[PDB]
Ligand binder design. Structure first.
Ligand SMILES: Nc1ncnc2c1ncn2[C@@H]1O[C@H](CO)[C@@H](O)[C@H]1O
Ligand SMILES: O=C(O)CCCC[C@@H]1SC[C@@H]2NC(=O)N[C@@H]21
Lengths: 69, 232
């Protein structure tokens, strides 16, 4: 499935690489929002099929971020 | 044996001779609220906005597990909690530290501490690095440098934890109290430059956004992270 933004924020960094198998609740990427560096968790285990965003990108609530396999 | 007397923060402290990062550990472990992570030295020390942090032995490097349950609109104040917490500890030791928007405390404009807050869904990690007796980077200072002698590491810890606990309880009562403490304790009147206009750092708003006064007189608000800022 698709993992969208839990809130607005700029991308600090991406923890995972494509093809990387993810763990439920594991760290996918980091968004600097409300003076915090927010780590975004994987709703399911899986594999990094697609990294939909870049570092330094401004994302908004619900925007597509990661697509797993 | 620590003899702490707090309600939430400091009810459990976990100490490490050394570690990559207290913040990482705090994030990656299941820990009750108010638990403190403290190490003699960190090797993979972290800083705000993907920067690095020197954590040599002799300083205080800790992480606090918090679970406030507050509107998103109040989450930007958590960093302030830590800074003001530090300011008040230095005040006890007769050191005058001021806040540099929005996560650094300074003494005579030399960095003596920094805050880093990280999110983990329900979990919120407050990380604070303060220079006590450790060796420090050029341009930075320490309590030992400020006071000209060794400062009791435990005493600084007990003091800081104690201020952060109180500040936390009042934060759960009225998250608006911190803003004033900050406004009343941060460097102001300084001409700054935004990269990517220039003006005066005259204040912050109720979201903790820096308020710059342009030369014409217009006002501009800065969101942390969104722009690069510098002192002139
Ligand atoms: N232990 C430290 N004490 C004071 N300043 C530091 C320390 N480690 C890193 N810094 C500075 O803090 C800045 C990041 O907040 C960096 O530009 C860096 O020079
Ligand atoms: O000024 C900054 O950039 C923030 C520095 C935060 C440093 C502390 S040391 C305790 C905690 N563990 C870390 O890895 N970082 C914070």
């Amino acid at each position: 499935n698709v993992v969208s933004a839990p809130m607005p924020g700029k991308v600090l960094r991406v923890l995972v690489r494509v093809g990387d198998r993810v763990r439920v609740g594991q760290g996918l990427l980091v968004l600097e929002a409300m003076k915090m560096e927010n780590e975004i968790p994987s709703p399911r285990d899986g594999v990094v099929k697609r990294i939909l965003v870049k570092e330094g990108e401004a994302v908004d609530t619900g925007q597509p971020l990661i697509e797993l396999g | 044996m620590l003899g702490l007397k707090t309600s939430i923060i400091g009810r459990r402290v976990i100490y490490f001779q050394e570690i990559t990062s207290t913040n990482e550990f705090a994030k990656t472990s299941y820990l009750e609220e108010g638990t403190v992570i403290v190490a003699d030295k960190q090797t993979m020390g972290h800083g705000a906005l993907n920067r690095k942090w020197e954590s040599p032995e002799g300083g205080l490097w800790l992480s606090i597990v918090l679970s406030p349950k507050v509107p998103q609109k109040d989450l930007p104040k958590i960093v302030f909690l830590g800074a003001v917490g530090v300011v008040e500890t230095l005040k006890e030791f007769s050191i005058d530290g001021r806040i540099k928007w929005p996560n650094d405390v300074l003494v005579n404009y030399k960095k003596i501490a920094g805050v880093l807050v990280e999110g983990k869904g329900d979990k919120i990690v407050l990380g604070i690095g303060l220079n006590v007796n450790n060796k420090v980077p050029n341009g930075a200072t320490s309590m030992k440098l400020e006071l000209g002698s060794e400062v009791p590491l435990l005493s600084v810890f007990r003091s800081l934890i104690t201020n952060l606990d109180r500040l936390y309880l009042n934060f759960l009562k009225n998250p608006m109290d911190i803003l004033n403490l900050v406004r009343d304790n941060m460097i102001l009147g300084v001409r700054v430059k935004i990269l990517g206009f220039e003006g005066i750092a005259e204040d912050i708003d109720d979201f903790g956004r820096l308020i710059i006064r342009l030369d014409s007189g217009e006002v501009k608000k800065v969101i942390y992270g969104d722009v690069s800022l510098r002192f002139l």
